[PDB]
Enzyme design. Sequence first.
Site, short mmCIF file in Angstrom:
data_model
loop_
_atom_site.label_atom_id
_atom_site.label_comp_id
_atom_site.label_asym_id
_atom_site.label_seq_id
_atom_site.Cartn_x
_atom_site.Cartn_y
_atom_site.Cartn_z
N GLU A 103 -13.69 -82.83 -14.90
CA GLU A 103 -14.65 -81.87 -14.38
C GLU A 103 -15.95 -81.92 -15.17
O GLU A 103 -17.03 -81.95 -14.59
CB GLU A 103 -14.06 -80.45 -14.43
CG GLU A 103 -14.98 -79.42 -15.07
CD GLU A 103 -14.44 -78.01 -14.96
OE1 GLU A 103 -13.38 -77.74 -15.57
OE2 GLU A 103 -15.06 -77.18 -14.27
N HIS A 104 -15.84 -81.95 -16.50
CA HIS A 104 -17.03 -82.02 -17.33
C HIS A 104 -17.78 -83.32 -17.10
O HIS A 104 -18.99 -83.33 -16.88
CB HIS A 104 -16.67 -81.86 -18.80
CG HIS A 104 -16.44 -80.45 -19.25
ND1 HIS A 104 -17.09 -79.89 -20.34
CD2 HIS A 104 -15.60 -79.49 -18.80
CE1 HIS A 104 -16.67 -78.65 -20.51
NE2 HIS A 104 -15.76 -78.39 -19.60
N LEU A 125 1.91 -49.22 -4.12
CA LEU A 125 2.79 -48.12 -4.47
C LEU A 125 3.18 -48.15 -5.94
O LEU A 125 2.99 -47.18 -6.67
CB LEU A 125 4.01 -48.15 -3.57
CG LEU A 125 3.62 -47.81 -2.14
CD1 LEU A 125 4.86 -47.87 -1.28
CD2 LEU A 125 2.96 -46.46 -2.05
N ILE A 126 3.72 -49.26 -6.42
CA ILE A 126 4.19 -49.27 -7.80
C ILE A 126 3.04 -49.09 -8.78
O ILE A 126 3.20 -48.47 -9.83
CB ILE A 126 5.00 -50.55 -8.07
CG1 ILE A 126 6.27 -50.48 -7.21
CG2 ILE A 126 5.29 -50.71 -9.55
CD1 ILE A 126 7.15 -51.68 -7.27
N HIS A 131 0.36 -47.25 -8.23
CA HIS A 131 -0.43 -46.07 -7.93
C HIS A 131 -0.60 -45.26 -9.21
O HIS A 131 0.26 -45.29 -10.10
CB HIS A 131 0.27 -45.28 -6.82
CG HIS A 131 -0.67 -44.57 -5.89
ND1 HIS A 131 -1.15 -43.30 -6.13
CD2 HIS A 131 -1.21 -44.95 -4.70
CE1 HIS A 131 -1.94 -42.93 -5.14
NE2 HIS A 131 -2.00 -43.92 -4.26
N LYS A 185 -34.94 -61.54 -4.20
CA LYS A 185 -34.80 -60.14 -3.82
C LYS A 185 -33.32 -59.76 -3.73
O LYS A 185 -32.49 -60.59 -3.40
CB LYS A 185 -35.58 -59.93 -2.52
CG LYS A 185 -35.11 -60.90 -1.41
CD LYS A 185 -36.20 -61.04 -0.30
CE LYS A 185 -35.83 -62.00 0.87
NZ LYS A 185 -34.76 -61.42 1.78
N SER A 197 -26.41 -51.90 -4.85
CA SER A 197 -26.27 -51.66 -6.28
C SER A 197 -27.10 -52.64 -7.11
O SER A 197 -27.41 -52.34 -8.27
CB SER A 197 -24.79 -51.71 -6.67
OG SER A 197 -24.33 -53.04 -6.56
C1 VQG Z 1 -22.86 -72.00 -17.18
C2 VQG Z 1 -23.12 -73.03 -18.28
N1 VQG Z 1 -24.37 -73.75 -18.14
C3 VQG Z 1 -25.43 -73.34 -19.05
O1 VQG Z 1 -25.34 -72.44 -19.84
C4 VQG Z 1 -26.73 -74.06 -18.88
C5 VQG Z 1 -27.95 -73.39 -19.02
C6 VQG Z 1 -29.13 -74.10 -18.82
C7 VQG Z 1 -29.07 -75.45 -18.47
F1 VQG Z 1 -30.23 -76.12 -18.27
C8 VQG Z 1 -27.84 -76.09 -18.35
F2 VQG Z 1 -27.73 -77.39 -18.02
C9 VQG Z 1 -26.67 -75.39 -18.54
C10 VQG Z 1 -21.92 -73.94 -18.45
C11 VQG Z 1 -20.97 -74.42 -17.47
N2 VQG Z 1 -20.12 -75.17 -18.17
C12 VQG Z 1 -18.97 -75.89 -17.70
C13 VQG Z 1 -17.98 -74.91 -17.08
C14 VQG Z 1 -16.58 -75.26 -17.51
O2 VQG Z 1 -16.34 -74.78 -18.56
N3 VQG Z 1 -15.62 -76.15 -16.74
O3 VQG Z 1 -14.38 -76.32 -17.41
C15 VQG Z 1 -19.38 -76.97 -16.69
C16 VQG Z 1 -20.28 -78.01 -17.35
C17 VQG Z 1 -19.67 -79.03 -18.08
C18 VQG Z 1 -20.41 -80.01 -18.72
C19 VQG Z 1 -21.82 -79.93 -18.63
C20 VQG Z 1 -22.44 -78.88 -17.93
C21 VQG Z 1 -21.66 -77.90 -17.26
C22 VQG Z 1 -24.01 -78.76 -17.81
C23 VQG Z 1 -24.64 -80.14 -18.10
C24 VQG Z 1 -24.07 -80.69 -19.41
C25 VQG Z 1 -22.63 -80.98 -19.37
N4 VQG Z 1 -20.49 -75.17 -19.43
N5 VQG Z 1 -21.56 -74.44 -19.61
ZN ZN Z 2 -14.67 -76.42 -19.40
#
Ligand code: VQG
Ligand code: ZN
Lengths: 960, 957
Positions: free
Chosen positions: A73-74, A299-300, A302, A858, A863
């Site tokens: 994912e990363h 129910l449980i 509540h 906007k 809320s």
């Molecule tokens: C929400 C937060 N992004 C920031 O704060 C941020 C702020 C300003 C920027 F310009 C920017 F690029 C990032 C975030 C999300 N994740 C990870 C969520 C997670 O954990 N999956 O398991 C996903 C992730 C994994 C690897 C990388 C990134 C994001 C950004 C590019 C570098 C490598 N890590 N940090």
């Molecule tokens: Zn992560």
Amino acid sequence: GIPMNNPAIKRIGNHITKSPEDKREYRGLELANGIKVLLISDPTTDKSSAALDVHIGSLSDPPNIAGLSHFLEHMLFLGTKKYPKENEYSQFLSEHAGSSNAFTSGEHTNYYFDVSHEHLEGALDRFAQFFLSPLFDESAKDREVNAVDSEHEKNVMNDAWRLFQLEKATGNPKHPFSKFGTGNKYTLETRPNQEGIDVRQELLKFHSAYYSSNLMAVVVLGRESLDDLTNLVVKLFSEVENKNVPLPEFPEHPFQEEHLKQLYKIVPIKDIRNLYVTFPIPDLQKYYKSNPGHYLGHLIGHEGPGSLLSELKSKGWVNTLVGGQKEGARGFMFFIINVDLTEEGLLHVEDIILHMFQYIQKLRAEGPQEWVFQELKDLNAVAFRFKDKERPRGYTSKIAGILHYYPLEEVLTAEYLLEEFRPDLIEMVLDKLRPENVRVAIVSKSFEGKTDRTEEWYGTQYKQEAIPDEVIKKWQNADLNGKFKLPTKNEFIPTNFEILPLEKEATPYPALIKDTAMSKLWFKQDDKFFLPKANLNFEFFSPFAYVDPLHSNMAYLYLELLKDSLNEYAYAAELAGLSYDLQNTIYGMYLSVKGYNDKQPILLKKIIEKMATFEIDEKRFEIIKEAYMRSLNNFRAEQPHQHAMYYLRLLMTEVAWTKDELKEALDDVTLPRLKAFIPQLLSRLHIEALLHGNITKQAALGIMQMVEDTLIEHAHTKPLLPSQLVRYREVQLPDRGWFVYQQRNEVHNNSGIEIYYQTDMQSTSENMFLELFAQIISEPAFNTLRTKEQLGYIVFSGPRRANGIQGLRFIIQSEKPPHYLESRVEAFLITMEKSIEDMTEEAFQKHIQALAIRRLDKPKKLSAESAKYWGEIISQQYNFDRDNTEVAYLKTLTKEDIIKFYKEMLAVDAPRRHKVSVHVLAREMDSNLSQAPALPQPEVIQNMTEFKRGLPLFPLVKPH
Amino acid sequence: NNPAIKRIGNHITKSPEDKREYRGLELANGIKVLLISDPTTDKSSAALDVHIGSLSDPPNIAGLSHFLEHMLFLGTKKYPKENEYSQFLSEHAGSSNAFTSGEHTNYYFDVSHEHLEGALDRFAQFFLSPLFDESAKDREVNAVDSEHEKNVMNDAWRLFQLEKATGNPKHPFSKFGTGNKYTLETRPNQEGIDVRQELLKFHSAYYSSNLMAVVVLGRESLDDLTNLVVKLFSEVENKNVPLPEFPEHPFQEEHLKQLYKIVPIKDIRNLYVTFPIPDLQKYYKSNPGHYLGHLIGHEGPGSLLSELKSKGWVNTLVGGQKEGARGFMFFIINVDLTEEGLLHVEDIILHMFQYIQKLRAEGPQEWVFQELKDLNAVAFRFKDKERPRGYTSKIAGILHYYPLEEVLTAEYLLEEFRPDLIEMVLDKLRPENVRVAIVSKSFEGKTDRTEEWYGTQYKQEAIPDEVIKKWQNADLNGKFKLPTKNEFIPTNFEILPLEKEATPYPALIKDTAMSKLWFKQDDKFFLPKANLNFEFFSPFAYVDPLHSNMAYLYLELLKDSLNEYAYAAELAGLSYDLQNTIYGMYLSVKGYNDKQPILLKKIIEKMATFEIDEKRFEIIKEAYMRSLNNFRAEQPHQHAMYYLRLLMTEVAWTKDELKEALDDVTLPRLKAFIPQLLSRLHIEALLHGNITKQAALGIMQMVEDTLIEHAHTKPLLPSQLVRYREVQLPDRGWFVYQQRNEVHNNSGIEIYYQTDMQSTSENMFLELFAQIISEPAFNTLRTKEQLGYIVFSGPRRANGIQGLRFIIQSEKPPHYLESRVEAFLITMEKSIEDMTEEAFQKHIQALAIRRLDKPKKLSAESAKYWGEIISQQYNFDRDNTEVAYLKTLTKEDIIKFYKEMLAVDAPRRHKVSVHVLAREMDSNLSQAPALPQPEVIQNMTEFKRGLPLFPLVKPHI
Ligand SMILES: C[C@H](NC(=O)c1ccc(F)c(F)c1)c1cn([C@@H](CC(=O)NO)Cc2ccc3c(c2)CCCC3)nn1
Ligand SMILES: [Zn+2]
Ligand SMILES: C[C@H](NC(=O)c1ccc(F)c(F)c1)c1cn([C@@H](CC(=O)NO)Cc2ccc3c(c2)CCCC3)nn1
Ligand SMILES: [Zn+2]
């Protein structure tokens, strides 16, 4: 005449069912390769969004490489064949008002972004390559493994992450549920190297084996028409290859027989006392049109008259309870009843659990109840008719997830509308809530030293024991308990959804419609959303709420006690979409009432009446005071960076009672002392309120005066004097100064740091210098400090606003010690000087437009508008048109303006630099790359009081 | 031997603790002279008393005697430069004053000890050859006029003059003695009088050497002092003037049995009872009038006040002999009145005569006279060493009345008991001989007479002889008893020996969470006395107006309750004061160390266990309501200073806020308040005098233990011990705050130029500048432009910040005053360019002498230290280090300090002005500069929020 078939499209769906209040336009479809698709057309939206959810997650990690889904994912953020710049994707988003995130669960990997609407296609293009051609660069993999390590490290000493994985480690070890999903440096790098695995090949294998188009759902929301959204999605995603991967199923429960009737004793990090009761159950997912799980949970779990919680609370054993079905994976689920434990409760776990089986037995005795089901069906139906409009980013992500589980035409409604009363299914599930299928866990410090096991990934200390048969049989023979009655008709269910017509004097922003010594009332009838809801916000000021620690403690305990008393009465209202919140502040009390306007005045009257006539129950006072003592000690176990942000608040505010002071002043709180405090606090008040929603000016004056009249009649409240309505100021740092305050976190083995560069009081000018600068450095600082230098998972930059002042702040949690992180932030700042100078004028205008889109976004729901106004009120700036005038001013800024700002206020050598740094040392600590500049010797703060006394105090900003 | 000296007095009897040397003598021209040699004094002093005063004014020129006394400051034949007397003094660390009573005119000064001759020379000329310059005579008449104006609406001066106007109009006692522009100019001009001739005539006729006494205090030997005084004063012409006498009493029999109803300015209720009596001054060795005043004015158990207080009629009582003139005296009994007391004046007076009648029945009591004799003896033996200026002035006044060898002791050392004189005076204190005056706003609109000089509204009626007779037949009242033998008389005067590690400054000998205890054993004065100073710090003393009102009433009620018990001690030289502050409470116990622990423990115990009498609480609450309103009748400059303080401090409740919040104070509310107040505390203390370190620790421990036992007191947190900051004004700022005084027809102004935080450099820049402009400012704004009688310039210190301040009360409007002050500031800039380097250095030495002037009694050394302690700076060696720095300053340093911080175009000027308009006012010369358009303050709360706040000063050690 028959249609012409697009071949990239297997089928178009029928009308996607939506709420009649939902003006967004929808189309569902399945591509030829089997990707499920929902297109959302919203011609008003300022940000567009897309999400893709792969139906594959940590349960499919290879057994020899834990956390591979997660690591993958990363790595998908870090470059593709068609977009090889490692931060192309993040940079593109950042420069177009965008953001992104992703998460890996057991069965889903979910990626999503939002972006300015005029850049959907370019963002979607960079995004789609994640699923076609990741680079999995070696240098990138060798760096990012540290982000994942550091993510795991934040969780290691967190009790919820520990218990989460401990449950997984006490079931069948041969079952994927038992896997460790995060990963860390060991499992993703060092162990693989000892074993000769080539981890870049293993990524390549996973991506190819599992990122198959038939396991993929995609959601795209933009301004474009549904037909143009369809072409766009077809263009970009048709080429994902379909490897017809069978969807993983897990039909054998991870808790077999030898895992039932067990008892686990767990040692926590914080001083907490919890009881967890778990029954294995079948997968109820396919029953979503009846939801027998949620009937029983309603129910449980509540909290009203006659409930299980109400009796365990009368007994002094528990304060809170949660009950209902818990997710597992395709093939197995759980049913839980968790409660927290008083000191007595901890000694009566066996009787608590007996009482739970007595209530469960009551439900078997009465059988299923169609009217109960009717109530849930009707409430869910109104919640969905009148659902708040969502921010697109969260919404695309949510739907991408559930396209896997429902027909296209039902994705929007499936998780809200009930259709079928199934008393057979209700019995079925109920039959599994039996002593022979129970698992019990007790979390208490009292097991310190008495454990003989260690969970391997977190280090959790616990013991396991069979529950004695004598106990099981005592529970199987739970007779009825007459304290347990089912709930009765919910009288709080609203029926007047009429939308009052817009009065001929309604205003685009809140208006000051009453300004007396007692009360300052702001009002706005909703002119945007037209839902039958309203928000009522009250700030109560009393000098005596914060005058010293002891009083601050009493103002806390009073509201905790009050909420505890109101809780059974208000639970009905909470289920019926009418909720409230009451918490002490450094100026007094905050009261907030939210939801369907219909019956709001009834609930608000009950709350104020309780406040003014409160009769403390001494048994409840002792219990809640003990819980509060714990709460304050438990702060020691918050994150290093959370600590850093806390100490900075203490340093820079005129008055601030520390946890330790509070804790030391909590002993001298006696019931008689509190009884005298309440009338005193209530004796002189000023009330400032925002009322905003489906109400008229006349209703809102009546509401306000209702509150006043009640306080006056029962508490004899009289107005405070204007000279008593003082706010706290922020410390004024000296030009060229640099102070460091250093503490230790004695729980977590990372350090934290906040760096605060104070600029000046807030004004249009200073606000937009800071904000535009923060836009320009936002991505580069993240990319430098976290992706390239891998200083920590937690890395943040941006504005910092308090008490009418402002500045720029860096926050980092890290392996490395604070002085090192200082160097690196400073090294980074220098490099921005050259980047901004060399930036073309087109790029500069691009950053302005990013900031502009963000600020003029906007609000989508009431809320969110309310909170924008509330902030203007609480800060006493009252600048409700702030966004138009500040964006207009932004558009006139030049890069030479920004460079002069940086060189006057931020640059190391800057004549008006104001820098304070909080250093939180890790538990075990001790008191090439770019060039870090040379830093002055810093003045070490040793005593917060002396530090504050020796410096001036800023003014308070002038109102509007 | 010497022709200039008629006689050289024998050993002048002095206290054995007095290390000063005395020599008395009569000059050949009949001037009586006392010489005082004290080689340690930093300031030398002299005073001359002339036995002529207002009672000798021409009948057609009221105030001449007073007017003359001003004029003598404004030049002589030998020193004709008008301001030469004041300027010489100002440039030599000196000061001067003067006053005119009915039979005396008293002139005195003090000066650097290295310049006694120069000072005394210029002083002597007042009595040889004043210029009475006509221009100066036409200016100074205005100073005397606005001196009268400040008094016109003051209730003490109205009544003072009204008594005079109700006597025999043919007796000099009825004369108006201040004079004003009407009597000293407008009427004389209209009547053809040459006022200058009249001054010359009065001065030659009555400033005769035979009516003068002279005191001189210096470091010189008694011989050198003798030669100096002979040089300067034997020139004085002797015209053998008879000492004026007034044998007939101003109150004759148509003036007796008379009742006066008088309307005040302030809301005050008062009863004045007066009896005429023969002149008792010749009886001074037995002092009959004081014996009787001791008893009739007693405040202890069995006393007249104790019963009038317990019936809820009276709160305070004063009684005794009041001075008239050679020939006549008065005996007075004056009480204040509760609301009830006002409706019962007849019974109040009946109780008065009941108590006098008891004293006739018992007859005189020698054991009483003996107790006074013994206490006075102790008082004189251990009298605190006096300040030179006040000492010469006092003695010069009494040298007329006593033989030289006994002038120091005459007013202290009683001889033999003379019960015949006691019974004689007592015999005058009878209903047929009484005059009665009531003061209440309840007479508004019910009066028919108007006193000429002040405008006082009143009514005069005879007391009905039915009422006279009821008082004549006053039975004895069992509630009255003579005082018991004073059990607080001190008997251990042993001076403990200097401990071997005693310190020259106070030492921090205890530092807990509850107590900082500063201690110094006296090493200078070696009298058997100690001063005990305690700050009780609590955040609930000032959190809001209601809490401040309760802290006040608590301490008043507590003092009220302690009063009878504590009177004995006060008679025995042991006194305390107990005051609410913005941070908590101040308690001071001063006096003979012997029975100090007994009193201190009684106070701390009454504090910690106080039971409020509902009836006192009603009466003291009502009194407090009244004093808050009565602030409306204070003087304009007093309003000026108060507003400035309500605008430059972080937190500050106004009188109207306190006044509104007072109706919300209930007895129950106050009972709940006290234990709370006492529940948390921090004690900072200074113990100083005849005590050991172990004794100090034991006093501090006694205080802590009493609190901890009865009030469960626990320490405060360090972070709660916060002090208020001063508002930080903006570079180039000018703010103006405007209010109206509804009572006085004068206006006031304070002008504050805020410089910077206190610091060794900023302190001595500011003080030296003040020194340089002190005299020029008084001379310009008062002597020359005659803006008003009250004209002040100097430093202002508050909350660690400081600046320069100008205060003025005038008839002119405050904006006009503002430009004249701005004009003065410009001309000072030239003065300082032109000033020679020697003149500059005189100003440096003058400030040095003043700052280094060491204190002469324990109380004054105690105060210098207490100022360091409550200010949290603790710089006990401040004077030496600051004076050292001061000597390094140059004229250039001062010029640039002026141009940066004070000049009209200064980059860092910070100027705030409070304008108090007169009752009916509306909202060549050196030229005033042009001024910006002042930011007008409409709201103190807003004003505050919009500015920074300064830091606080760091402690020293
Ligand atoms: C929400 C937060 N992004 C920031 O704060 C941020 C702020 C300003 C920027 F310009 C920017 F690029 C990032 C975030 C999300 N994740 C990870 C969520 C997670 O954990 N999956 O398991 C996903 C992730 C994994 C690897 C990388 C990134 C994001 C950004 C590019 C570098 C490598 N890590 N940090
Ligand atoms: Zn992560
Ligand atoms: C005590 C106060 N002196 C000052 O403030 C002061 C401060 C600094 C100086 F350099 C200076 F010269 C005076 C004061 C006392 N009096 C008068 C007291 C009073 O009223 N008798 O009836 C006496 C008096 C009458 C007339 C004159 C002077 C003094 C001084 C020179 C000008 C003419 N008037 N003001
Ligand atoms: Zn005068």
